[PDB]
Amino acid sequence: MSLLIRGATVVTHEESYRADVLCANGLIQAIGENLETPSGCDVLDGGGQYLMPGGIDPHTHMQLPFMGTVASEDFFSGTAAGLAGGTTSIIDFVIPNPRQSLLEAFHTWRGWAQKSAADYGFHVAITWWSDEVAREMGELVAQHGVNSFKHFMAYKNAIMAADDTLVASFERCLELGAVPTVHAENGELVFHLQQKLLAQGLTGPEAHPLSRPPQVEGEAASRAIRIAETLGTPLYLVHISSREALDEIAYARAKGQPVYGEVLAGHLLLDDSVYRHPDWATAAGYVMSPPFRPVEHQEALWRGLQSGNLHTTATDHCCFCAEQKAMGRDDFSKIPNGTAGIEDRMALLWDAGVNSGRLSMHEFVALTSTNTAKIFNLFPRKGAIRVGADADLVLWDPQGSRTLSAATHHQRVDFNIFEGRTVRGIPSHTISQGKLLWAAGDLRAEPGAGRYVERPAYPSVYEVLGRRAERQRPVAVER
Amino acid sequence: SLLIRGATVVTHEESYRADVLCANGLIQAIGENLETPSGCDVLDGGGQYLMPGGIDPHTHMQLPFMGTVASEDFFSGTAAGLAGGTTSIIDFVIPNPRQSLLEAFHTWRGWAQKSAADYGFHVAITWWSDEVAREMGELVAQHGVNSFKHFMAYKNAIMAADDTLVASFERCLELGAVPTVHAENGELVFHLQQKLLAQGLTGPEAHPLSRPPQVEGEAASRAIRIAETLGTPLYLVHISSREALDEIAYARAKGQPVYGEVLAGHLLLDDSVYRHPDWATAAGYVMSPPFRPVEHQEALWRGLQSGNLHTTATDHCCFCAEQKAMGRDDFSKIPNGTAGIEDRMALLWDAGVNSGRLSMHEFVALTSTNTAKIFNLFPRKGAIRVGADADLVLWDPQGSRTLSAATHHQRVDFNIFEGRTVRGIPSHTISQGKLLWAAGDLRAEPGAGRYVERPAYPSVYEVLGRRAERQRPVAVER
Numbered sequence: 036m037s038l039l040i041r042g043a044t045v046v047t048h049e050e051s052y053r054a055d056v057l058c059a060n061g062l063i064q065a066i067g068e069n070l071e072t073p074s075g076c077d078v079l080d081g082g083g084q085y086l087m088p089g090g091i092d093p094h095t096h097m098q099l100p101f102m103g104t105v106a107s108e109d110f111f112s113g114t115a116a117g118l119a120g121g122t123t124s125i126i127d128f129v130i131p132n133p134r135q136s137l138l139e140a141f142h143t144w145r146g147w148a149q150k151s152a153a154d155y156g157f158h159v160a161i162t163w164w165s166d167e168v169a170r171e172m173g174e175l176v177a178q179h180g181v182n183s184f185k186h187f188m189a190y191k192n193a194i195m196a197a198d199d200t201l202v203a204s205f206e207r208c209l210e211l212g213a214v215p216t217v218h219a220e221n222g223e224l225v226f227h228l229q230q231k232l233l234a235q236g237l238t239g240p241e242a243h244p245l246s247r248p249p250q251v252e253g254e255a256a257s258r259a260i261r262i263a264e265t266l267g268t269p270l271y272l273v274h275i276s277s278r279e280a281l282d283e284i285a286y287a288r289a290k291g292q293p294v295y296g297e298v299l300a301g302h303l304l305l306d307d308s309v310y311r312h313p314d315w316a317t318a319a320g321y322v323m324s325p326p327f328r329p330v331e332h333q334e335a336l337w338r339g340l341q342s343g344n345l346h347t348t349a350t351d352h353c354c355f356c357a358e359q360k361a362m363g364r365d366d367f368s369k370i371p372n373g374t375a376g377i378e379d380r381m382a383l384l385w386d387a388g389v390n391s392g393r394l395s396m397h398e399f400v401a402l403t404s405t406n407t408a409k410i411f412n413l414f415p416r417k418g419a420i421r422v423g424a425d426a427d428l429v430l431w432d433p434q435g436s437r438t439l440s441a442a443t444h445h446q447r448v449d450f451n452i453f454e455g456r457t458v459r460g461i462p463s464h465t466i467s468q469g470k471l472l473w474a475a476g477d478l479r480a481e482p483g484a485g486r487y488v489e490r491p492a493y494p495s496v497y498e499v500l501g502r503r504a505e506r507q508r509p510v511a512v513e514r
Numbered sequence: 515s516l517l518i519r520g521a522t523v524v525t526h527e528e529s530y531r532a533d534v535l536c537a538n539g540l541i542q543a544i545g546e547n548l549e550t551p552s553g554c555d556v557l558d559g560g561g562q563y564l565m566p567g568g569i570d571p572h573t574h575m576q577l578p579f580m581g582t583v584a585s586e587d588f589f590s591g592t593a594a595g596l597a598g599g600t601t602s603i604i605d606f607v608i609p610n611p612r613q614s615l616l617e618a619f620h621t622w623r624g625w626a627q628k629s630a631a632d633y634g635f636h637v638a639i640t641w642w643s644d645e646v647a648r649e650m651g652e653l654v655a656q657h658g659v660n661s662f663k664h665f666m667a668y669k670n671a672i673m674a675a676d677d678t679l680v681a682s683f684e685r686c687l688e689l690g691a692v693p694t695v696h697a698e699n700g701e702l703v704f705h706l707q708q709k710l711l712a713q714g715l716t717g718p719e720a721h722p723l724s725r726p727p728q729v730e731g732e733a734a735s736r737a738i739r740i741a742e743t744l745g746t747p748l749y750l751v752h753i754s755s756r757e758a759l760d761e762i763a764y765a766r767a768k769g770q771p772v773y774g775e776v777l778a779g780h781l782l783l784d785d786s787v788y789r790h791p792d793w794a795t796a797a798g799y800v801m802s803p804p805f806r807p808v809e810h811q812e813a814l815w816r817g818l819q820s821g822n823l824h825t826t827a828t829d830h831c832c833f834c835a836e837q838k839a840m841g842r843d844d845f846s847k848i849p850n851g852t853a854g855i856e857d858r859m860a861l862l863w864d865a866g867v868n869s870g871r872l873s874m875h876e877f878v879a880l881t882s883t884n885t886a887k888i889f890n891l892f893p894r895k896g897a898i899r900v901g902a903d904a905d906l907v908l909w910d911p912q913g914s915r916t917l918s919a920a921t922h923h924q925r926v927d928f929n930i931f932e933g934r935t936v937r938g939i940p941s942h943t944i945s946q947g948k949l950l951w952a953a954g955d956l957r958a959e960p961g962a963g964r965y966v967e968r969p970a971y972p973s974v975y976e977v978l979g980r981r982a983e984r985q986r987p988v989a990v991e992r
């Protein structure tokens with residue numbers, strides 16, 4: 036018990052309509068025009084606003100230990116700041132060291148995430164292979180609510196998976212009904228260009244984009260895609276930044292292949308000139324992988340969203356303050372990679388996509404929660420306004436205004452990649468598991484309030500794959 | 515000296531009536547009603563088309579491979595070529611892993627000495643070290659080699675992985691050499707092979723299932739993007755799939771120098787051949803990449819017509835029945851390869867020219883001139899011009915030939931086009947100014963052919979160099 040949102044237009048991934056919505060006991064209890072108020076149930080007035088599923092950010096790195104160091108944003112600050120921005124759940128990554136047990140890395144991460152203010156889940160990264168990793172994956176799916184496994188195709192000599200691994204792991208994912216996910220950059224090429232730029236003496240952040248140009252993403256997307264086609268698995272590609280990688284996804288989808296693509300707001304709105312800023316720390320602030328790209332790539336990504344070839348939005352929320360960035364003051368390859376975004380994603384997208392008329396409100400919802408839930412088999416528990424669904428919601432004021440700044444954001448990091456940008460259309464209120472956790476300026480997150488969210492295996496795409504595999508079965512010739 | 519009189523000269527771009535005089539290995543004169551020098555033999559070409567002799571840039575004469583040695587040797591293979599209108603080859607030095615390239619190279623020169631017509635070599639990069647790199651440089655500077663092949667498949671044999679591709683392509687750029695690639699993802703092939711064998715599918719019908727088209731498309735994608743990133747051209751051998759062809763068109767659509775090669779096999783045969791109820795027949799078709807579903811044939815023809823595929827070849831790599839039978843209980847041990855050197859030109863004329871898919875000019879481009887230009891042999895080869903080498907084919911658009919292993923000159927007991935009848939045939943073939951095939955009479959002689967050196971830095975390198983210069987990485991000062 037008990038929270039009634041009254042007066043709003045409910046906006047789903049597919050329709051708009053006027054209704055009141057009642058939350059109790061973490062769930063949406065009722066939806067209708069003029070609902071009755073249970074006694075002492077709190078009431079939020081939503082006249083002239085839109086009430087939508089709360090955002091799900093399927094790509095966070097809260098307090099990740101990475102590139103000599105540990106991300107500035109912990110599970111609490113991170114998940115809180117997300118709430119302030121209308122995001123109600125995350126999926127983060129367990130990234131074991133190579134040769135490290137997955138169940139061990141997984142219990143370590145569950146540890147770190149217990150302090151979450153909002154619902155959370157994990158993908159598990161496959162950073163090495165053995166019969167043991169195969170075994171443990173099965174357990175994570177059977178016992179621990181994991182149904183998606185990440186592969187890094189870059190970060191050579193660190194966590195990179197090569198073809199022999201990708202093949203073995205993807206086959207395992209097929210066996211388990213789990214979704215393979217990939218960070219698609221060709222690692223040998225990145226490694227090769229990094230050395231060559233450093234050997235020429237190019238050590239600045241401006242050399243970061245040059246060390247990993249768009250065709251390096253395109254290559255790796257092609258390869259992850261064709262391994263998935265060849266093994267009979269779906270595939271989810273994280274943070275697509277390039278035309279080249281988008282074209283591979285469209286090409287595969289165009290042949291009937293289940294491939295999904297995620298995009299970050301930064302890759303929709305920023306270009307690679309940012310790395311040439313006169314101030315080192317500013318430029319360094321933008322360093323993440325894949326990097327920001329020449330302008331023609333933004334337009335292409337927008338169209339991918341408009342055409343159904345890109346499916347989800349996310350942030351790759353991986354915060355490093357200036358002093359951490361400056362670990363690579365003399366060597367761009369040692370700047371810790373990552374930008375902040377959890378709090379800003381929904382407003383950035385609404386303002387650039389809906390106000391401009393590129394995206395309908397419905398696509399906005401699809402791209403901010405529902406597609407993610409459907410892909411990872413959380414629908415209709417999440418990303419849905421219906422009776423029985425988790426009461427994760429955001430109330431949106433289309434005329435409200437906000438100016439993005441590191442000075443004022445709830446993200447624990449001293450840099451914002453959209454510093455000074457002003458957006459129209461903001462989350463006035465955010466509701467997580469039935470509770471009002473952000474209210475016109477007031478953040479009310481509390482450590483440990485979040486739950487761990489299990490995702491069942493075998494999303495329905497695996498039924499279709501199953502029937503195809505059966506129909507395609509090889510038949511010997513008799514002689 | 516040899517005068518060809520009364521033919522229509524057909525090049526990669528035009529047709530005209532003229533006689534052609536050859537002497538001393540070379541074309542001496544071209545013009546209407548040329549004078550006959552005394553002693554000169556005269557070939558009457560009235561009603562026929564005189565074209566450059568075909569260049570086949572992909573042969574494997576007497577290759578030791580998959581536990582045996584190809585049945586066709588450098589003499590029998592180049593002689594069979596000449597009967598087919600093909601006057602020069604490019605074959606492959608394939609050193610074993612950890613074997614010196616130079617060692618392998620001289621060995622292959624020995625094997626090739628017996629060739630009946632002009633020949634040259636690509637050299638395969640089957641392992642990597644500083645010594646390989648040094649050897650590549652000596653091959654280019656001293657030995658007339660200007661192209662290096664990389665195999666993306668054949669895991670635990672001659673397969674190159676990304677780290678070798680990158681380092682080799684970079685070495686290729688340094689030397690002005692053309693990287694070439696056999697584009698199949700070896701890890702997927704290897705995985706599928708085991709899986710299929712583990713399920714007891716051991717027959718030839720499983721060869722194609724073990725390397726479906728996307729495995730080729732992936733590897734073309736990857737070679738292409740490595741080449742783009744390192745700033746080299748790229749040549750992809752025997753493209754069989756829409757997927758690979760689409761990767762080439764995509765890259766050429768961004769201004770990237772990528773060339774594709776195609777075999778007649780892959781233009782005209784489909785994967786149903788592998789389900790033949792006779793084991794030996796099905797096995798005769800086993801090569802890599804395998805023949806594909808029909809839709810890929812049409813895509814390939816369209817590649818030719820659009821300028822996204824550039825050369826034709828044969829992957830001439832012959833194994834007789836007893837040799838193919840080494841894989842009788844395991845398709846993955848069937849020696850991979852089919853014959854085609856003799857048949858390439860008539861197959862293509864017949865399927866492409868008679869149908870109106872290709873002009874005669876395109877036919878010339880795709881059978882000699884584009885290969886010449888790509889590997890820096892134009893206009894010495896693939897050109898009918900004074901001072902060019904006198905490698906010529908006289909083509910009777912009315913003749914007919916029926917292809918058969920019982921009648922072909924290829925030293926192998928199987929022909930992947932057994933029984934097919936083509937219209938338009940080479941009536942005569944001239945190599946080094948000499949009449950080596952004359953309407954059924956083959957006059958090839960062991961050892962007549964020459965080793966043909968190809969200079970480095972084809973023209974594309976000047977363009978890449980201007981590009982590289984305009985994209986100098988430039989540091990921001992602070």
Ligand SMILES: [Zn+2]
Binds near residue numbers: 273274324325
């Ligand atoms: Zn990533």
Ligand SMILES: [Zn+2]
Binds near residue numbers: 094096351
């Ligand atoms: Zn990430």
Ligand SMILES: [Zn+2]
Binds near residue numbers: 752829
């Ligand atoms: Zn090959």
Ligand SMILES: [Zn+2]
Binds near residue numbers: 572574829
């Ligand atoms: Zn070959």
